[PDB]
UniProtKB/Swiss-Prot annotation, chains A, B:
Localization, UniProt: Cell inner membrane
Effect on the protein upon substituting residue 317 to N: Loss of activity
Domain of life: Bacteria
Portion of the full sequence shown: 160 to 510 of 877
Name of the protein in question: Lipophilic envelope-spanning tunnel protein B
Residue ranges, annotated region (MCE/MlaD 2): 1-113
Length: 351, 351
């Protein structure tokens, strides 16, 4: 027979004589349990039978299937009572990997508390902004709409630095590399597609791939800042003597289509300095010369023969933001002015 | 007696001596269980009685009815506890088909994990855009409002290519053919008919039939692109010097009625190029000559004797989009211009 040791943080629902399963086949039993010399953890030593000594490998993971948990899920709760023998007395199930040396001679093993905690994969360290809607073992990493990861740990390091970590499955592991971003998506209010499921999920880590050297630690920024952190982004610091009602997250518009987003608005003594970012599409477009016209304010002028509306439309007004007047050739200097309307941009009159 | 083998990925709630049912009549029992030589799967060999040897056919499917699962459903949860003997010890039920040879001599059988997984039908491979709201065994294929299929598998192939597969029942199988589209419907917000049920369901595969050679693999596109993929569609690439507030999914209007939809908006260095699509109704209508006028902007001109409103109405404005001025005869050239309003389209002045 084989006599191996398990290290658990507590005994759980396991009694002496409780049963050990492989593929839900009883292939052994729990022999004894004892507190190890330090009071910290409980060592449970089990006895795999003589026939099944070749099942237990060095790379095996043992997990605890004892009691029953009833999990209510959104849009219906499927609670299935699979195994009746585990409720009364407790059980330990285990997996056998493909290629590992067979274990022997009282080899220790960590005892995971659940099947979900004993999933294989790669630990990925994250430096989170805040843990406001993030949860331990409930926040997924989506990729192409599929669940790829699971936030497994969430800590508040000293200095007020929330960091967590994530198990991803091996498939995607080759996708993670340099300039590969993980940004958290808010469950944003969708008018065209009504999805209550997404609304109930909450915060959601989105993986967007890049190329380069494989890395294993990332920095998650807020969703607005994500554009700024993209690999090929162009960042213009544009000044203005007034905010003109332009918030931090207004869209930035060329020829009617959004080419960029405002990132942040900083108030100084000289005026209001914006920092806007630009997707690659308008990166090629700029050519070093442009004018920047506010779309946040409506303007109507009354006249006998002259009737004009300047700088806005009602839909434009709800979106707001900054309009681009592209030029032919320039050098992409550091600072640009923000003109109050279109005709002061044609007059080149920043006053 | 008959001694046949079942191959299951795990033993489940089955014990030795657990019972085998046909039409919920005990017609045998589980004799033994053993792990096969590879560690991958468990072989459970059962013993159908001597009377019932003619029941087991070659084309039989065995499924697992063991334990109990309580499924909460929307708009009320009907949880029925049908069979009490399966809870304590476990059971295997099986079906006998109409015309098959009777099985004998330790013939193997796959053991499905549920009655829903052991439904007959045809596997249909799908190349999905994303698996954002799609689920395994929860996403149906509607046809005429009835559940016809069930998305049974959802994978993330390398390269970021989500593909899944679907069991459809045999009836519809003759309906699937060439130019037969499967497009996913979003649970769109309905103002006239309030349906919370549809809202709770989420994504929904809609089957629309076509004619031709029978095919067994499809490509699902997004709902907006579906129009573009229809069998008799006419696609116009129309240019404009500005977006004029025309989004990617605006309706496209002839004589007040929607005849087409804008498909996508691409920003270039020359301007904004749209790609609109057309239903067969306006396919016959075009005759190779038309003018394209924006309906997204309001225009009011003030005058002593001349009062006119150009290009929009408030309802038109909420819908927005492109208006068609049909002509008598033409050749349907590749590129068309998008005029800013109606009078510049009558003046033939694209500047």
């Amino acid at each position: 027979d084989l006599m191996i040791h398990l290290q658990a943080p507590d005994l759980g629902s396991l009694n002496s004589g409780s049963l050990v399963y492989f593929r839900k086949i009883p292939v052994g039993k729990v022999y004894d349990y004892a507190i190890n010399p330090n009071k910290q953890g409980v060592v449970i030593d089990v006895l795999i039978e003589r026939r099944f000594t070749d099942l237990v490998k060095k790379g095996s993971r043992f997990w605890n299937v004892s009691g029953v948990d009833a999990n209510v899920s959104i849009s219906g709760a499927k609670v299935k009572l699979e195994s009746l023998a585990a409720l009364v007395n407790g059980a330990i199930a285990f997996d056998s990997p493909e290629e590992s040396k067979p274990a022997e001679a009282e080899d220790t093993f960590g005892l995971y508390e659940d099947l979900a905690h004993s999933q294989r994969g790669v630990i990925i360290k994250l430096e989170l902004p805040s843990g406001a809607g993030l949860t331990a073992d409930s926040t997924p990493l989506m990729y192409q709409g599929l669940e790829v990861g699971q936030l497994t740990k969430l800590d508040l390091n000293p200095g007020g630095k929330v960091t967590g970590e994530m198990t991803v499955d091996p498939s995607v592991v080759t996708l993670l590399r340099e300039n590969t971003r993980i940004e958290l998506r808010n469950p944003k209010l969708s008018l065209s597609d009504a999805n209550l499921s997404a609304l109930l999920t909450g915060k959601t880590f989105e993986l967007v791939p890049g190329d380069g050297e494989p890395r294993k630690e990332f920095v998650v920024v807020p969703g607005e800042k994500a554009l700024l952190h993209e690999p090929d982004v162009l960042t213009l610091t544009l000044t203005a003597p007034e905010s003109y009602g332009i918030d931090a997250g207004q869209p930035l518009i060329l020829h009617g289509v959004q080419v960029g987003q405002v990132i942040d608005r900083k108030l100084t003594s000289k005026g209001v300095t914006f920092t806007v970012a630009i997707e690659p599409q308008h990166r090629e477009l700029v050519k070093g010369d442009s004018k920047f016209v506010v779309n946040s304010r409506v303007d109507v002028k009354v006249g006998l023969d002259g009737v004009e509306f300047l700088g806005a439309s009602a839909s434009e007004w709800i979106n707001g933001g900054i309009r681009i007047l592209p030029g032919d050739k320039g050098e992409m200097k550091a600072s640009y002015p923000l003109y109050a309307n279109l005709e002061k941009a044609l007059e080149n009159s920043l006053s």
